[PDB]
Amino acid sequence: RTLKAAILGATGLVGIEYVRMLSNHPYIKPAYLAGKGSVGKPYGEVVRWQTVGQVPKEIADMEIKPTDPKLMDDVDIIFSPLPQGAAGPVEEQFAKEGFPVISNSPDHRFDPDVPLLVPELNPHTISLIDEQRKRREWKGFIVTTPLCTAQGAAIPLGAIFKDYKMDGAFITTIQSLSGAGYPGIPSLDVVDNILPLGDGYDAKTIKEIFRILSEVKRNVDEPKLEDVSLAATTHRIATIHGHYEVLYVSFKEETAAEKVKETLENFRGEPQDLKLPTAPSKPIIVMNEDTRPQVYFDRWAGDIPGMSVVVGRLKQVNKRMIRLVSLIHNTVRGAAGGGILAAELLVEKGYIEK
Amino acid sequence: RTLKAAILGATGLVGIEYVRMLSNHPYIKPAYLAGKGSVGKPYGEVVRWQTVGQVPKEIADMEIKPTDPKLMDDVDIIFSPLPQGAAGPVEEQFAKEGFPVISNSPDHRFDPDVPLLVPELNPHTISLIDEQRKRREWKGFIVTTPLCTAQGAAIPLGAIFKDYKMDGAFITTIQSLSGAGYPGIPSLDVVDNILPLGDGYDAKTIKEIFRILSEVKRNVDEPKLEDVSLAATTHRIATIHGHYEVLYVSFKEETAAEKVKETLENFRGEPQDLKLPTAPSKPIIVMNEDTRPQVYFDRWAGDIPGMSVVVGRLKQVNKRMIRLVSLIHNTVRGAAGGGILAAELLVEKGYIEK
Amino acid sequence: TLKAAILGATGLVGIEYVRMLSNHPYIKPAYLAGKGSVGKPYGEVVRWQTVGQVPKEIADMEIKPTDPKLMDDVDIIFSPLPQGAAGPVEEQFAKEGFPVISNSPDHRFDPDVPLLVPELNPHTISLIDEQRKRREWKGFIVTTPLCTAQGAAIPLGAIFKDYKMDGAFITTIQSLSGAGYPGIPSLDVVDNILPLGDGYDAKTIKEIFRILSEVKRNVDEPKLEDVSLAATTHRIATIHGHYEVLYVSFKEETAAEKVKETLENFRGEPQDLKLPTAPSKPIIVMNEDTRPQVYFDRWAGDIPGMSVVVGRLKQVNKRMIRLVSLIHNTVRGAAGGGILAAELLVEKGYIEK
Amino acid sequence: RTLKAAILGATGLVGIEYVRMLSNHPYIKPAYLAGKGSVGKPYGEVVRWQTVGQVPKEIADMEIKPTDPKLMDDVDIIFSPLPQGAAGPVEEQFAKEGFPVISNSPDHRFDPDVPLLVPELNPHTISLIDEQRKRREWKGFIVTTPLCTAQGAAIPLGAIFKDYKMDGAFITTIQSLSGAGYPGIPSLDVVDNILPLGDGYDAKTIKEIFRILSEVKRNVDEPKLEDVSLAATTHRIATIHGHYEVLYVSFKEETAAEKVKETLENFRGEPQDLKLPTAPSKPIIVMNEDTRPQVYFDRWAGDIPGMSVVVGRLKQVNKRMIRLVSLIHNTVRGAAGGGILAAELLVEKGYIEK
Ligand SMILES: NC(=O)c1ccc[n+]([C@@H]2O[C@H](COP(=O)([O-])OP(=O)(O)OC[C@H]3O[C@@H](n4cnc5c(N)ncnc54)[C@H](OP(=O)(O)O)[C@@H]3O)[C@@H](O)[C@H]2O)c1
Ligand SMILES: NC(=O)c1ccc[n+]([C@@H]2O[C@H](COP(=O)([O-])OP(=O)(O)OC[C@H]3O[C@@H](n4cnc5c(N)ncnc54)[C@H](OP(=O)(O)O)[C@@H]3O)[C@@H](O)[C@H]2O)c1
Ligand SMILES: NC(=O)c1ccc[n+]([C@@H]2O[C@H](COP(=O)([O-])OP(=O)(O)OC[C@H]3O[C@@H](n4cnc5c(N)ncnc54)[C@H](OP(=O)(O)O)[C@@H]3O)[C@@H](O)[C@H]2O)c1
Ligand SMILES: NC(=O)c1ccc[n+]([C@@H]2O[C@H](COP(=O)([O-])OP(=O)(O)OC[C@H]3O[C@@H](n4cnc5c(N)ncnc54)[C@H](OP(=O)(O)O)[C@@H]3O)[C@@H](O)[C@H]2O)c1
């Protein structure tokens, strides 16, 4: 019937989305709220509920418990949105104790035996678990979801690359504060200011996009991914949720904006075909107004709110270049929501027992 | 020997920069402050001094006077930052009454006998005045300055186009509130939001960049400007001053980021050679840190604060593509400061008598 | 099963009528009216500056003219119209026989028009009968007070009912939505605080006084004429939520702990009658010294946005306490208060099925 | 001759104001710039210049030096804006080495032998230095300046208390981000939010106000300060500088707002009588418009920008109650500026030699 989940980092900006979404989930229960600094306290009392609505009634009085595999014989699934550096070793201890771990943290994203999973783009990479368990000599496993900023690009770019001779994408991002966590970005960095994130962050963004694109099954074979040029210039400003990206996308041969638009509108993959509960009907929603999408108004779009990437502004720049913009909800699709969708995919494929 | 200026729209976001800058100018005097709504009242009491420092002491008691040429016998120069639509015909009346008019308004920016002037890029186009006067059959003249957002791009792009085989620039802008004037942008459009300006504004921005580039004297001759692809995706957020732009610039042939960076660092033009009072020593300042320029910290940079375009983040994307960002103070270089510098060039060239 | 028209349906108040009536057990949002936007699909023109998404069965409705003759089938008019335009329009609707629940200022001081906070002065709906006879109309007008006045008068009314309150000195830090759209320019509030000025301060206390003058008290000291009120009002860059700091003085020694229990226990006719939009706790009291906060508490309560959230109850001296209050300015402060008033009027037989 | 100052915490939000103001001071030079983390590096490269203008050119290349009494033989004055906890003992080490220490830190604010100094209000309390040197057995001394929030209230309240039977003041504050320092207040605490500071901060505020008021020499003797009731409810929002306060002020007997207004307009103290360089002409500036003062427009008011408290909105509430508002620049008057003014007074009264 129902799987009992633990949410690690349950009070954090990603944790609250697991709590919110799992409270309404048909078969995965938020059964165990883990923390460190606030172990012992009622969740409703200490959480910064920086998201829609209010802490779920049935969750407010639940006690925050230790992050300890041995206290968790009763848990079936581990969701892990832990800070970088701390996540890595914890997620291994859970896998070594036999748990399926779905991680939103960066630590394991480039391990060659760990899926870097966007369920609509590279669902077959869950097969990596087999080799992982064998070589790591553990009975559980780790899957990761990618950097939210990498997903806001990789989703529409992956859709495009599957059917077109895309040879470059040159990206500018304007990301929200919640992507940095709490305390995260100091207020003085973003009041009357735009904070560039710097070369390191630009680089890791395209690095993750390349891995995700390398794992997409294409309908055309040109150009080779090695010959695709990607670049990002990334920034944070004083928005709460929603990462906005402007993409100039180039092609090896003449490509019509209107054909690419239809490809984006019609985009679907295995989560849709399988009818997974958290799969949006329209993982890419395309808007036609020239002032949409906007962060405030469109970050909760779609039949599963916050699970759809919202694209718009599709326009021919020249015969071999188009402009589009994309908006992703950074803690729903970009983190917890993609993590729950991944869990549903793993359950359906037989990797996690119901 | 000195000149008396009138400042039309003196209380507006551009007008206050003319007031602030001219209060210290060695020879152009802010003598007549014009307006519509508050005519009769002291300047200091009606103005929203949304800029550095305080209303100048010898200005605050000056009365706001009508915009009427028949009241203006004693004035030598008109500065005109009037709204789109209202500006065109008023600017014509002033020219017909014999006044030199330096306008920051869009209305005359594409008249082929009217200069669209960035003093460092196309100073020779002041020559259009001779034909203008003949054909319009007036004794005065109109000179315009370009859209601030177009200058933020055209200054660095013009310096590059001069010396390199630039064949494309793909731009994303993150502009400040003050560019829209007052009441300008509603607060609800920009709190926890990014506001795209739309296809019209994107189109007019590149149209102005094309006209400016078409008038830059190049040291190379490939490609022809007709084969350069330009595109912009423009937005406003809740910054007060400073327009921030991300430029991906492509070349016809292999081109080194470090060479382009030196061309930018070394950029100077006729305003520097002439030592005009408002000419920055470094019309383009290059920063090397991967988190600079930042809007709050770098919008008043330079020996003439706010007159320099600040570029940074220079980086190779691939052999034929570089990334850079630029920051322009939208009401100093982008409007009043550019206008004062234009006037200084016209005075020095004998178009305005001293 | 009653049909409502929502006037000003695309406005910051109108979107709350649409959001809340979409799921109401018995009042259906049947007609969306406008001015500039008439003839367009509601979903295409609306700035949905509120939680969630435009309700699907409302997004496809066509915005219709604000015209009393075109509304044969409607039982209730909700009227969040601009000051000046509101007055005459609301009169035409009452004249045509419609119950008119108004959030606009125009009629708020007419002595035959309720200025209604359902938990504080529900008996003033009685004014309607004399209203209908003297104005000679079959419909009627009821108004809801200024959101800022409600943020103060709800907790001040609960206190005034049971304690010898003789003063309240108020500072407000109000949200941008209170001014509507285009409303407040962005340059007035970025890196700034915008005082609203003497007129707004004066109208806030004038409304509070009329409300307090209509509260049924359990004590009789001091007389209201001897109560001193003052407000200093401001807006900042918050989206919804009006936040108020109140220093409240009393004629005699009064315990903050007792006043805190009175606020926690406060209930009125809406709660007694179990009206669908009546919150269980019209006043919610928080204990943390950093709460309420605008972002986190403005949607509090079993009916989200309908409760006034109070906190920071503290003894200043024997005859003075400090508290703060937070009201959702378009839910409790406008449309949600309006809907609760409608349910009260239905229950009391003033609006017929 | 000039006095050579050391500025501790030179790169902080208070440090930058010492740097800016001392750069133009007639006789106190910013000679030694101290730090901890950034020791060794050029000041210009590491500072966040979150203030007006730019880092002074003669300062930019100065190296940040260790906070160590032994390196400072050449130093005549120490300005100390160090974090609470760390300041106490350090400021003691400097005084023990014979240095005059002007502190903005809270640590010694309530030592009964250490002045808690607002130069216009309690200038005679510098006398405390004599007992201080004797009892502590040190050649130097410590003087503190008060919490900026407390100064915003105590300046107007002290001018009133001097001449009226004031018996209560009930204060609400709306404070800026820079008052918390950097990284200071998290962005997520203030975007679309108001952050209450809590009971502790409300109490320390009135505790400091009482000490200040108790040291004001009055012209009336009722009521006794022990019988005055003070309360504050404090908050921060997303403003950069400037603390705004609403005060309801009660009196034991009938008192006219217009009379109190004139008292405020006319306020002056020893700093003005002595013509100290950093003493504003009008330490309280009174505005008449019912929408002034406003944080952005009035935080730099006055002939010494940022050194005047700006009051407005004077209004009769009842015969014994008035309402006013005050705005203080929190790092100028509220910190460095008041600190420099204290220094000038201490030099003028002969506590600091030359
Ligand atoms: N936010 C996004 O948009 C986003 C998107 C995708 C992925 N992610 C990733 O998800 C992770 C968390 O992000 P966030 O934004 O939610 O961070 P955050 O708001 O700073 O949350 C930190 C949370 O983790 C807990 N925690 C910290 N250290 C721990 C430890 N050593 N052991 C157990 N629990 C610990 C804390 O609990 P206590 O307070 O009880 O100690 C807190 O609940 C990061 O790796 C981030 O990169 C972020
Ligand atoms: N802001 C920028 O970044 C920027 C940069 C480049 C150029 N510009 C251009 O400069 C112009 C002004 O922009 P702004 O940002 O300064 O606008 P703003 O703040 O809205 O001010 C407009 C001013 O013009 C006056 N005015 C309006 N209509 C007039 C009329 N018919 N006759 C005479 N005076 C009139 C008003 O004076 P009263 O209120 O006393 O009537 C007001 O002071 C626009 O065309 C704009 O596109 C703006
Ligand atoms: N906002 C609050 O917090 C709040 C709270 C309490 C009460 N109120 C009151 O409620 C009223 C509405 O406020 P708001 O904040 O919703 O304003 P808003 O967002 O500016 O909305 C104005 C609305 O009224 C319509 N409208 C304008 N003029 C009209 C006319 N002559 N005839 C018919 N419809 C007209 C507009 O429709 P078109 O766009 O189709 O022209 C629009 O839907 C005001 O009286 C306000 O004082 C506001
Ligand atoms: N901001 C205001 O409005 C305001 C007003 C009045 C009073 N104050 C007081 O002034 C003090 C500083 O506040 P701020 O707002 O300027 O803080 P801030 O911006 O965080 O600055 C802290 C500064 O102190 C230095 N520092 C930190 N620990 C140190 C140590 N152990 N030894 C030596 N230096 C150390 C740091 O330099 P490195 O990083 O190079 O080590 C940094 O330059 C506080 O006590 C505050 O209460 C502030």
Short mmCIF file of C-alpha atoms in Angstrom, two decimals, chain A residues 80-347:
data_model
loop_
_atom_site.label_atom_id
_atom_site.label_comp_id
_atom_site.label_asym_id
_atom_site.label_seq_id
_atom_site.Cartn_x
_atom_site.Cartn_y
_atom_site.Cartn_z
CA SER A 80 18.19 13.76 0.93
CA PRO A 81 18.54 17.50 0.34
CA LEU A 82 21.61 17.98 2.49
CA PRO A 83 24.26 20.73 2.12
CA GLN A 84 27.31 19.93 -0.08
CA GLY A 85 30.16 18.15 1.78
CA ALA A 86 27.85 16.80 4.48
CA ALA A 87 25.47 14.97 2.03
CA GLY A 88 28.05 12.68 0.41
CA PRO A 89 29.06 10.53 3.39
CA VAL A 90 25.53 10.50 4.86
CA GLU A 91 23.95 9.28 1.62
CA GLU A 92 26.53 6.47 1.48
CA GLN A 93 25.75 5.39 5.06
CA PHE A 94 22.06 5.10 4.10
CA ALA A 95 22.82 3.11 0.91
CA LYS A 96 25.11 0.84 2.91
CA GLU A 97 22.24 0.23 5.35
CA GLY A 98 20.02 -0.89 2.46
CA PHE A 99 17.96 2.27 1.76
CA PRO A 100 17.08 3.73 -1.59
CA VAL A 101 18.35 7.28 -1.42
CA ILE A 102 17.03 10.01 -3.74
CA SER A 103 19.42 12.97 -3.30
CA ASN A 104 19.13 16.57 -4.34
CA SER A 105 22.68 17.32 -3.17
CA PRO A 106 25.65 17.94 -5.49
CA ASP A 107 28.10 15.43 -3.91
CA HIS A 108 27.34 12.28 -5.94
CA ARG A 109 26.03 13.94 -9.20
CA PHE A 110 29.19 12.98 -11.16
CA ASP A 111 29.85 9.53 -9.79
CA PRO A 112 29.75 7.40 -12.99
CA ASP A 113 27.56 4.69 -11.33
CA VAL A 114 25.02 7.25 -9.90
CA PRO A 115 22.13 8.45 -12.10
CA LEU A 116 21.94 12.28 -12.56
CA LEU A 117 18.29 11.97 -13.21
CA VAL A 118 15.68 14.05 -15.06
CA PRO A 119 12.83 11.50 -15.43
CA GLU A 120 11.53 12.90 -18.78
CA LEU A 121 15.06 13.04 -20.29
CA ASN A 122 17.25 10.13 -19.17
CA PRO A 123 14.97 7.58 -17.37
CA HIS A 124 16.98 4.61 -18.66
CA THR A 125 19.99 5.69 -16.59
CA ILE A 126 18.35 4.17 -13.51
CA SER A 127 19.99 0.98 -14.87
CA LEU A 128 23.24 2.33 -13.43
CA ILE A 129 21.99 1.15 -10.00
CA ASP A 130 22.88 -2.44 -10.93
CA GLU A 131 26.57 -1.74 -11.42
CA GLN A 132 26.51 0.68 -8.44
CA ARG A 133 25.29 -1.95 -5.98
CA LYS A 134 27.82 -4.46 -7.34
CA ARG A 135 30.86 -2.25 -7.26
CA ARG A 136 30.08 -0.29 -4.07
CA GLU A 137 29.10 -3.58 -2.46
CA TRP A 138 25.91 -2.13 -0.99
CA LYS A 139 22.26 -3.26 -1.08
CA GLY A 140 20.61 0.21 -1.15
CA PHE A 141 21.41 2.90 -3.76
CA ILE A 142 21.88 6.57 -4.57
CA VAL A 143 20.19 8.50 -7.40
CA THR A 144 20.67 12.27 -7.69
CA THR A 145 18.67 15.09 -9.28
CA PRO A 146 20.60 17.88 -11.03
CA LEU A 147 21.29 21.48 -10.05
CA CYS A 148 18.02 23.38 -10.49
CA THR A 149 19.67 25.86 -12.80
CA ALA A 150 21.03 22.99 -15.00
CA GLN A 151 17.44 21.57 -15.20
CA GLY A 152 15.84 24.86 -16.26
CA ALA A 153 18.13 24.72 -19.28
CA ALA A 154 18.55 20.98 -19.82
CA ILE A 155 14.81 20.27 -20.03
CA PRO A 156 14.02 22.49 -23.07
CA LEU A 157 17.55 21.99 -24.52
CA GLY A 158 17.19 18.20 -24.14
CA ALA A 159 13.84 18.31 -25.93
CA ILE A 160 15.47 20.33 -28.75
CA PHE A 161 18.73 18.25 -28.99
CA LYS A 162 16.70 15.05 -29.36
CA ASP A 163 15.21 16.30 -32.70
CA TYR A 164 17.45 19.08 -34.04
CA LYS A 165 21.09 19.74 -35.00
CA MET A 166 21.58 22.02 -32.01
CA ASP A 167 25.29 23.09 -31.85
CA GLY A 168 25.22 25.69 -29.02
CA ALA A 169 23.25 27.37 -26.28
CA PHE A 170 24.38 30.63 -24.63
CA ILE A 171 22.53 31.17 -21.43
CA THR A 172 21.92 33.99 -18.96
CA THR A 173 20.20 33.10 -15.64
CA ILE A 174 18.47 35.26 -13.06
CA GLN A 175 17.92 32.95 -10.10
CA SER A 176 15.94 33.28 -6.88
CA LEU A 177 17.20 33.49 -3.30
CA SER A 178 15.75 30.16 -2.12
CA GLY A 179 18.24 28.24 -4.34
CA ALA A 180 20.98 29.25 -1.87
CA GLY A 181 19.25 27.97 1.20
CA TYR A 182 18.97 29.75 4.58
CA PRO A 183 20.76 31.90 5.77
CA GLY A 184 22.02 31.67 2.18
CA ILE A 185 22.37 35.01 0.36
CA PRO A 186 22.91 38.10 2.59
CA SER A 187 20.23 40.78 2.03
CA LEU A 188 22.86 43.40 1.24
CA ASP A 189 23.93 41.39 -1.83
CA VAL A 190 20.57 41.70 -3.56
CA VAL A 191 18.82 44.88 -2.45
CA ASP A 192 19.21 47.33 -5.36
CA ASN A 193 21.81 44.96 -6.83
CA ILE A 194 22.33 41.90 -9.09
CA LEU A 195 24.73 39.31 -7.67
CA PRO A 196 26.83 37.35 -10.27
CA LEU A 197 27.57 33.83 -9.01
CA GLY A 198 30.97 33.68 -10.67
CA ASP A 199 33.01 31.33 -12.99
CA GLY A 200 32.86 28.27 -10.74
CA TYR A 201 29.08 28.31 -10.74
CA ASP A 202 28.82 29.09 -14.49
CA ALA A 203 31.11 26.06 -15.12
CA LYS A 204 29.31 23.57 -12.92
CA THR A 205 25.98 24.56 -14.52
CA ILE A 206 27.15 23.63 -18.05
CA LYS A 207 29.02 20.58 -16.72
CA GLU A 208 25.74 19.13 -15.41
CA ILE A 209 23.85 20.12 -18.57
CA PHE A 210 26.49 18.21 -20.67
CA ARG A 211 26.11 15.08 -18.59
CA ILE A 212 22.30 15.17 -18.84
CA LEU A 213 22.45 15.81 -22.65
CA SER A 214 24.99 13.00 -23.15
CA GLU A 215 22.35 10.61 -21.74
CA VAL A 216 19.40 11.73 -23.88
CA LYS A 217 18.38 9.23 -26.64
CA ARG A 218 18.37 11.25 -29.87
CA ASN A 219 16.34 10.96 -33.08
CA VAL A 220 19.13 12.69 -35.08
CA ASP A 221 22.92 12.21 -34.71
CA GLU A 222 24.52 15.59 -35.64
CA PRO A 223 26.33 17.38 -34.31
CA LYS A 224 28.13 15.18 -31.77
CA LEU A 225 27.73 16.36 -28.20
CA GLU A 226 31.55 16.98 -28.05
CA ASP A 227 31.03 19.68 -30.68
CA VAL A 228 28.17 21.46 -28.91
CA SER A 229 29.15 24.83 -27.37
CA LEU A 230 27.45 25.64 -24.03
CA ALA A 231 27.97 28.75 -21.86
CA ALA A 232 26.14 30.23 -18.88
CA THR A 233 26.37 33.59 -17.04
CA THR A 234 24.55 33.13 -13.75
CA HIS A 235 23.12 35.64 -11.22
CA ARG A 236 20.85 35.81 -8.17
CA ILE A 237 18.39 38.64 -7.43
CA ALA A 238 15.71 39.26 -4.78
CA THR A 239 13.07 36.82 -6.04
CA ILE A 240 11.93 34.10 -3.60
CA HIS A 241 11.40 31.09 -5.87
CA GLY A 242 11.74 30.57 -9.62
CA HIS A 243 14.85 30.57 -11.77
CA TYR A 244 14.49 32.52 -15.03
CA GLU A 245 16.89 31.78 -17.97
CA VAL A 246 17.32 33.39 -21.36
CA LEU A 247 18.70 30.95 -23.96
CA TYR A 248 20.09 31.77 -27.39
CA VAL A 249 20.20 28.36 -29.16
CA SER A 250 22.18 27.78 -32.37
CA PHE A 251 21.80 25.00 -34.95
CA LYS A 252 24.17 23.50 -37.52
CA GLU A 253 21.60 23.99 -40.29
CA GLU A 254 18.55 26.25 -40.89
CA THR A 255 15.89 25.52 -38.18
CA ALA A 256 12.50 27.22 -37.88
CA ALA A 257 11.50 28.72 -34.50
CA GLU A 258 7.93 27.53 -35.13
CA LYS A 259 8.98 23.83 -35.52
CA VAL A 260 11.06 24.00 -32.34
CA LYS A 261 8.07 25.61 -30.58
CA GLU A 262 5.83 22.66 -31.58
CA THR A 263 8.49 20.23 -30.38
CA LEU A 264 8.59 21.96 -26.96
CA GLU A 265 4.75 22.06 -26.67
CA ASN A 266 4.47 18.34 -27.55
CA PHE A 267 7.33 17.23 -25.30
CA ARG A 268 6.59 14.17 -23.11
CA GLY A 269 8.54 11.16 -21.86
CA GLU A 270 8.30 8.01 -19.77
CA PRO A 271 6.82 9.77 -16.63
CA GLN A 272 3.83 10.91 -18.81
CA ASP A 273 3.46 7.57 -20.60
CA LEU A 274 3.62 5.71 -17.28
CA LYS A 275 1.18 8.20 -15.76
CA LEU A 276 3.31 8.67 -12.61
CA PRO A 277 1.34 10.65 -9.97
CA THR A 278 3.82 13.58 -9.91
CA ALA A 279 4.37 13.71 -13.68
CA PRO A 280 3.03 16.96 -15.17
CA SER A 281 0.80 16.45 -18.25
CA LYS A 282 2.93 19.14 -19.84
CA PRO A 283 6.49 18.99 -18.54
CA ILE A 284 7.17 21.94 -20.85
CA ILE A 285 4.40 24.59 -21.06
CA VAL A 286 4.81 27.15 -23.81
CA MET A 287 3.42 30.67 -23.42
CA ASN A 288 2.70 33.00 -26.39
CA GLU A 289 2.58 36.52 -24.79
CA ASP A 290 5.70 38.60 -25.26
CA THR A 291 5.84 39.51 -21.53
CA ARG A 292 5.45 35.88 -20.24
CA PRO A 293 6.64 33.82 -18.49
CA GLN A 294 7.13 36.04 -15.42
CA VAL A 295 8.62 34.67 -12.23
CA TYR A 296 5.75 35.59 -9.87
CA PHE A 297 2.89 34.54 -12.07
CA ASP A 298 4.12 31.37 -13.75
CA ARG A 299 6.35 29.63 -11.25
CA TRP A 300 3.38 27.53 -10.00
CA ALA A 301 2.00 26.62 -13.42
CA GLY A 302 0.72 23.30 -14.60
CA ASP A 303 -1.56 20.47 -13.47
CA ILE A 304 1.05 19.53 -10.79
CA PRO A 305 1.94 23.06 -9.65
CA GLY A 306 5.67 23.85 -10.04
CA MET A 307 6.49 20.62 -11.92
CA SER A 308 6.37 22.16 -15.44
CA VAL A 309 9.17 24.24 -17.00
CA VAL A 310 7.45 27.27 -18.58
CA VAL A 311 8.99 28.44 -21.85
CA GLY A 312 8.20 31.45 -23.90
CA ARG A 313 9.43 34.25 -26.11
CA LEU A 314 10.31 31.74 -28.92
CA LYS A 315 11.68 33.85 -31.76
CA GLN A 316 13.81 33.44 -34.88
CA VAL A 317 17.03 35.45 -34.42
CA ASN A 318 18.58 34.20 -37.75
CA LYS A 319 18.24 31.06 -39.89
CA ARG A 320 20.47 29.10 -37.46
CA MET A 321 19.64 30.81 -34.13
CA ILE A 322 16.57 31.09 -31.94
CA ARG A 323 15.82 32.90 -28.64
CA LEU A 324 13.67 31.40 -25.85
CA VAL A 325 13.29 31.87 -22.18
CA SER A 326 12.57 29.29 -19.49
CA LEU A 327 11.29 29.44 -15.93
CA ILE A 328 11.62 26.56 -13.49
CA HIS A 329 10.36 26.38 -9.88
CA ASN A 330 13.75 25.66 -8.28
CA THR A 331 12.55 23.68 -5.22
CA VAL A 332 9.62 21.77 -6.85
CA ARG A 333 10.72 20.62 -10.35
CA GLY A 334 14.29 21.78 -9.53
CA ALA A 335 14.53 19.68 -6.34
CA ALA A 336 11.86 17.93 -4.29
CA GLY A 337 9.25 17.47 -7.00
CA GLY A 338 11.75 15.92 -9.45
CA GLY A 339 12.94 13.82 -6.51
CA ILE A 340 9.44 12.45 -5.82
CA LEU A 341 8.93 11.84 -9.57
CA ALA A 342 12.22 9.92 -9.59
CA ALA A 343 11.00 7.82 -6.65
CA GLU A 344 7.77 7.03 -8.52
CA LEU A 345 9.80 5.99 -11.57
CA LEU A 346 12.02 3.73 -9.38
CA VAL A 347 8.98 2.14 -7.79
#
